[PDB]
Amino acid sequence: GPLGSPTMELVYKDRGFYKHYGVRVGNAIYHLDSQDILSTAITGQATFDKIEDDGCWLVSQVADLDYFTDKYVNSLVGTKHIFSATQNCETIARDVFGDSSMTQGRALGILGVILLSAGLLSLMAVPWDVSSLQQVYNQLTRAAAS
Amino acid sequence: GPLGSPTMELVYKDRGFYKHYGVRVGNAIYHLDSQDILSTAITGQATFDKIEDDGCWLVSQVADLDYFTDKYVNSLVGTKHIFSATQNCETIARDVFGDSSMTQGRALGILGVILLSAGLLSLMAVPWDVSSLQQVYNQLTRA
């Protein structure tokens, strides 16, 4: 089902070792501004930026991705997250989620869930159907020592 | 090369979709206490714990992994990292690195880099030889 506002498009660039997702709204693309996904994870700091579409992004079929992302949207509602934004992201909540009452902060958290979920699932080559997504989610939430 | 003390081993359990890594010293295993890497990444909070070996861990051949992990350790020396630990890990520096003078924080940063690197590189199906690792390093860091 839908991830956000009526015109938001999940897009990506294929960087070979990983696919890098963003969201396109009109000619604006919102995405994480660093390719160093390992540094991002280790430091707990990720910054969104808004860029112009360069014509080189591909569109993702969203399929049932929301089944998976909703689990984290719900589970990390009252939880500090790692996402900040540049000054160019003033209207991200409205653009991406269609909700002017949502704070920028809350929008960054939800969008960061979506983009990291898409990127991780792509790395795992997991299709975005409910069955496949539930299977991955079960392994992610399995007790670490088990 | 070696990643730590002379008896330290890189170990994992295979979850199919990914491998969950830890480091072993004797029958003590130090690992992240959640394998929900999304929650870990989104919240910027990873907690090490120390468990007993159940005999069901596999040993990784480390090859040249330290070539890659050392680069990240060196980049994040004067840099906050996300790794904390339960109190069971008070002796991780002496156990894992063989250095009682090393701070717990420094030990956790190094081991966190190693475990996340191993996990990510495995997902990428990258040989842990220097040439392969230099190629993915260059892509990650935009050199």
Author numbering:
A (entry chain B): -4 to 141
B (entry chain A): -4 to 138
Q: What are the paper's exact sentences on this?
A:
Our structural analysis has shown that the topological rearrangement first observed in HPeV1 and leading to the apparent destruction of the active site configuration of the enzyme is indeed a general feature of *Parechovirus* 2A proteins.
Intrigued by this observed disorder in the C-terminal region of the *Parechovirus B* structures and its apparent influence on protein oligomerization, we decided to extend our structural characterization to the H/NC-motif type 2A_2_ of Sebokelevirus (SEBV1), the sole representative of *Parechovirus C*, which like *Parechovirus B* 2A_2_, exhibits shortened N- and C-termini compared to *Parechovirus A*. All 134 residues could be modeled in both chains, and the final model includes an additional 5 residues at the N- and 7 residues at the C-terminus that were introduced during the cloning procedure, as well one ethylene glycol molecule, a tetraethylene glycol fragment and 256 water molecules. Overall, SEBV1-2A_2_ is similar to the LV 2A_2_ structures (3.70 Å over the full chain; 1.2 Å over the core 97 C_α_ residues), in SEBV1 however, the C-terminal α5 helix is well ordered (and extends to include two of the extra residues past the native protein boundaries) ([Fig fig1]).
